Amino acid sequence: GTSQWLRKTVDSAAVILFSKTTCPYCKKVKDVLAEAKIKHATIELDQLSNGSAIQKCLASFSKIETVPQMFVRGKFIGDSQTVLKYYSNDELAGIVNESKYDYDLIVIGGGSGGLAAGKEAAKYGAKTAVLDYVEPTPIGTTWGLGGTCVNVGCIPKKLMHQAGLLSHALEDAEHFGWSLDRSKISHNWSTMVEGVQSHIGSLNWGYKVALRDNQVTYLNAKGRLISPHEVQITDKNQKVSTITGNKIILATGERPKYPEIPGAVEYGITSDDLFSLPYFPGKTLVIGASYVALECAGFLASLGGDVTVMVRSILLRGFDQQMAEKVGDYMENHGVKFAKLCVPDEIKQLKVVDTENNKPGLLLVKGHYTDGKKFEEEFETVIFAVGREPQLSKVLCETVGVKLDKNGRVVCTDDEQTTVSNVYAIGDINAGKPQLTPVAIQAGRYLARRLFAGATELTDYSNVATTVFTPLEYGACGLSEEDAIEKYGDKDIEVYHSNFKPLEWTVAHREDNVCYMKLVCRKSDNMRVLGLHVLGPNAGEITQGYAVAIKMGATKADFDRTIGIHPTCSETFTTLHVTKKSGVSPIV
Amino acid sequence: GTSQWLRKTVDSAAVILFSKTTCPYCKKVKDVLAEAKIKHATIELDQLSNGSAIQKCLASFSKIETVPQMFVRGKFIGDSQTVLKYYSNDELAGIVNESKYDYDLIVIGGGSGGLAAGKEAAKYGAKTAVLDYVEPTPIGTTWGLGGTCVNVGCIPKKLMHQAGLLSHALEDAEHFGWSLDRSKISHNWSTMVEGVQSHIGSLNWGYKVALRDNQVTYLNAKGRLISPHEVQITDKNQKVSTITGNKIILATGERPKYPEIPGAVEYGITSDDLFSLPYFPGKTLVIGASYVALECAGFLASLGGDVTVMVRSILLRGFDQQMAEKVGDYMENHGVKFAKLCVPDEIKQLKVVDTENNKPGLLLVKGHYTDGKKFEEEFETVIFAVGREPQLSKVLCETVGVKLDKNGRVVCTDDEQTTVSNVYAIGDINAGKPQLTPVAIQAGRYLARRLFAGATELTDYSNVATTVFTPLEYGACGLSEEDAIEKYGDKDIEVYHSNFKPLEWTVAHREDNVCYMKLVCRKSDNMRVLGLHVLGPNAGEITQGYAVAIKMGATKADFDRTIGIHPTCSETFTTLHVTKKSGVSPIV
């Protein structure tokens, strides 16, 4: 068991030093390495439950059992004196640089997961390359280093959400005594996009700087894995070459889908285009009902836009549907129109985008409702948010032997290993995992530590909290009510729930009994909290802390024992008492 | 052990029914009681670890061991047939109404704790009276039912905080693209106060309604405890009478202190006056450095006011002082002036308050700095926030035998019992407890359940989270860093910490590396989180959920295993890695 771990660690680490805290010769080694600007991992055996068993199995690799012991890419390099020997003779540089491969790690994809993995690996001496390339959208939109969330995802989405929330801050400001003429207030799309894009630009730059400062090689090149250790790269000039790496991390993410209907690629846009759009979308149709669809519809409406969402069947499939309905009801009551049970048949162009006055074009959308009536309506912008897909045939030679699933995602073990043992996948292309930026980051960093610093900790993908940044935000952690019932049976599920009203909404004259929270609990497991759900402002701030408690196995009694902070929305989780089975109303 | 609990429960409950779920005759009893509008507690013995031992000891009270068993104020009333007997003969009303006392419970004080205790008790059949009276402030300010937080505390304070935050929403709105002429925007104090007061009024009314609907008697009368069971009440007409109750709850709270200097009572105001002030305070001096002082200074400054805080020694004594300094630095950088190491000697009047144009007066404040230089400056309003004190000589005849401490607070056991065994104290007058509205509520409700429904659960006063609603909010749960070090020693404490920047602040051009969080952990107890501290927006929403985890014994590893929600401020608690001892900078 310990020999398995040590065999893997030694084989994989780029530059690793086994050591103890109470060891001067070790410090001498650390100092020479620091002095020489040689990064490495370090495992202090005097701080492990079985450090002394480890010290013994080490002699199966070194033929000695003392510390320090220094390894490079699978080979015992020496004790203290052999390290100093190499140094003094200035042979240490060529030694810690000897490898069969150009790199210890090549990351294909410069997004949330891949950048986090790359940096963390370089920390421990892994010679690292990060490849990133942004295939243009059909209208030619491209962007810089950082991935989907930085450039066309969580970051611009939340900032445009914020611009929409400020709309309601302006309305509220009057009731709290601020004098402002709200009829001479308008929103300027292009000013907002410019501020958003200037922040993204600072992130593109910040990442490039971070990579340089960790001695990671950044290649703005499309990578293609041609064999287990060989990556072919095409640069801006279309020049092709080949680099080699020991470990490979696939972190290439996904791109938006279009529906296969006439006009969709030619005249519609996706989220990829929305967040840098050089004209105001104007009267907009969003096709879809994902969290992307609803978030985009929501902020466009709060910015004053005429907004319609075309929904084929239900809102937020895969989420708790009681909550999804409440999310949708709030939106419909606040200016989002819904074309329900409706699908698009074709987009026709009525006006071309004015690339020189920054005005939208004009489109005719034809579709049909389930009741057979035709949908026909003009929109200035049509946004598709009908899901996302991986692009791996563009990255993976089928001959390498990386197994994909039905949907084109990478089939992985619980340590992110593909069917090719030196090749790993993180982020959105890892089949079956929550598609979220902090998951991708935790995966990539924890993987890098296992590869290059002998760590064993795996990423825990269970009970991963989410927030949907709709106009009224929805945060959740754990199971939907319907999934809990399906799993355990209705008789074993108790649901506590309440409406609430943010104090901020009182003077502002906003709604009673719209915000809402519930805990879905398991009767037979001490009222274990199986899922937490909250609809209200700052729902991501509310939910995050409870995710720690849920990971620790929180019960209803743990919530009750805890004292609220007053006045907050979150404190209502500490006094819930109405159950659903009681029939008593949750209104307050 | 079980006989102790049962003896107390039977003696104390007003109307209680022992029962089992699987008992038709019990349901028959419940139905007759429901039919008759007779409220009562109920203990289903088939749902207790020792319900069957309880069923036996019951015969020491009833001479029977079967369910149902119904008690009223210490006396076995009967089995099913004796209950029905009393009903059919319409003797049940006079039976469940027989008592040596007018009331099963008299609550002296209609605040957070007392109202919560009163309602909860009435639920189980306790005939309850709630007394509340609001002694006017020196300028004559008074208010309605609900206590300090509702009327002159947490509620108006947070709403005026919100009015100040909206100031920064207006500034931010421009950078997110909203066109608004910020130089023709001003704030109107009186409009704000009117909205705030209309909400408080709805709470005053809502409480009166809640009390009526739970058959609680509300007396707007000053109560004085003259013997263990006798309360003397003085009404608006100054008419004096005496009511009697079995249990007494003292929940009379505190009032602001004034410094003993000339002019203070005559010309200054406190928070009691601030939240209904009929004129704008204008150029304001806040004397004090409590969380009250800083919160008030902060929103007055965000409303555009010229604001000065006079500070005798340190900010936020009793709070983590690193955090207090960061709170104070943010305020000084955002328009609050601080007269440091300074105390007031006298207030002189220069202009009388214009009661008919709603304008402030004008005051000359004289004081002195520790360096001997004189302080002399004119202010339109001077606000004292130099602490609060109980008023119990106004409530407690010294002959009753309720022990007070040095500061005039009530000395209580951990079940809130005073030295007079039927008299309990909750809320701010309970010596040694956190002075917070949700503590008072949890205390009062859990006490009511122990008195009148045989519950045993005590209120847990440890690791009670707080938030200070300064312009940059500060949330905390558990120990300050200095208190952890003092308790466990510096070598046993590790502190993880980071700056962070709300995404909302980026486009808005606000500060990097001002918001800040830290976890204070114990090395020798598995890096147990001893205190959590966060400075940033929505800090109360951030902190609340983590208080559940801390109550459950969260470690640093529980935080790390948990996946962030992105983008939020709170997710930074899930990736902390820089320790203080490492000397590495927390900036990001």
Ligand SMILES: Cc1cc2nc3c(=O)[nH]c(=O)nc-3n(C[C@H](O)[C@H](O)[C@H](O)COP(=O)(O)OP(=O)(O)OC[C@H]3O[C@@H](n4cnc5c(N)ncnc54)[C@H](O)[C@@H]3O)c2cc1C
């Ligand atoms: C509108 C939208 C909003 C979202 N909001 C949130 C949110 O609020 N919170 C949250 O947690 N998650 C959110 N997400 C999801 C989040 O963006 C993803 O989970 C995350 O960005 C995926 O990280 P990744 O490492 O898997 O891939 P990505 O971030 O997509 O990075 C993959 C990189 O590799 C590039 N690439 C692809 N192929 C190659 C190749 N052959 N060679 C070189 N480079 C290549 C890609 O162009 C890209 O730059 C949102 C997503 C969308 C679409």
Ligand SMILES: Cc1cc2nc3c(=O)[nH]c(=O)nc-3n(C[C@H](O)[C@H](O)[C@H](O)COP(=O)(O)OP(=O)(O)OC[C@H]3O[C@@H](n4cnc5c(N)ncnc54)[C@H](O)[C@@H]3O)c2cc1C
């Ligand atoms: C400016 C300020 C801001 C605050 N902000 C917060 C916050 O944000 N969050 C938080 O949790 N806490 C906050 N607090 C504290 C909170 O208000 C108290 O902890 C809480 O209100 C105390 O509840 P209580 O039941 O002990 O007494 P109280 O709420 O003060 O109620 C006591 C009632 O009894 C009345 N009374 C007194 N004597 C008699 C008598 N003889 N007969 C009849 N009635 C009598 C009193 O007039 C009063 O109505 C704040 C306090 C202040 C002063």
Ligand SMILES: CN(C)Cc1c(O)ccc2ccccc12
């Ligand atoms: C129809 N059903 C009640 C759920 C629902 C809403 O409540 C609100 C908006 C919707 C839009 C599309 C589909 C369903 C929606």
Ligand SMILES: CN(C)Cc1c(O)ccc2ccccc12
């Ligand atoms: C002086 N010391 C550094 C702490 C401190 C601040 O940082 C900022 C404002 C203050 C006001 C009064 C007392 C102390 C204060």
Ligand SMILES: [Ca+2]
């Ligand atoms: Ca509670």
Ligand SMILES: [Ca+2]
């Ligand atoms: Ca984490």
